[PDB]
Design a binder for this molecule. Structure first.
Ligand code: HEM
Length: 153
């Protein structure tokens, strides 16, 4: 469980992300695809993109980034009380997109990395820690669902 103090650290930096959601989302997905190119194979929509330049130039990829961070922000603001928002996400990701839990770990790291790059002042080690805990909580709850449906592994 995160403390109120840990949640305030998470939401404080998240408020800055919202000042440029598209930029953050585009950096996050690109970091993911480069660092773990198997994740890009899961997107029919983006697998024709080969270079970083190409990825940066894609408006559609930018759009999807926004969809991703908008959905995550709605979850984080619930400070753990996210059942209604996390359940349909788990379902689509398990049964339709077929995204293994390991990939959620990879994107979580991409998120931390980018937040470190863009907000060094408001993202010190305590904030980093807090954010890692919130993302673990997200995964843990997604995994429980996957298991119910028979997709944990
Ligand atoms: C931060 C974690 C993630 C969030 C919050 C998130 C959110 C979303 C949202 C809201 C959608 C559209 C609605 C839906 O189908 O549920 C979407 C679709 C999708 N997601 Fe996730 N996602 C996450 C992680 C991932 C990861 C790691 C991958 C794996 C490569 C992935 C692959 C997909 C795919 C393939 C679609 C459909 C894309 C399309 O063709 O339009 N997602 N995601």
């Amino acid at each position: 469980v995160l403390s109120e103090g840990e949640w305030q650290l998470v939401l404080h930096v998240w408020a800055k992300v919202e000042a440029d959601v598209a930029g953050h989302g585009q950096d996050i997905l690109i970091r993911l695809f480069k660092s773990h190119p198997e994740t890009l194979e899961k997107f029919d929509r983006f697998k024709h993109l080969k270079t970083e330049a190409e990825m940066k130039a894609s408006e559609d990829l930018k759009k999807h980034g926004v969809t991703v961070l908008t959905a995550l922000g709605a979850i984080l603001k619930k400070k753990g009380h996210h059942e209604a928002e996390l359940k349909p996400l788990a379902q689509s990701h398990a049964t339709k997109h077929k995204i293994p839990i390991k990939y959620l770990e990879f994107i979580s790291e991409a998120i931390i990395h980018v937040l470190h790059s863009r907000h060094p002042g408001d993202f010190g080690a305590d904030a980093q820690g807090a954010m890692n805990k919130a993302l673990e909580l997200f995964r843990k709850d997604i995994a429980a669902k996957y298991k119910e449906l028979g997709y944990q592994g």
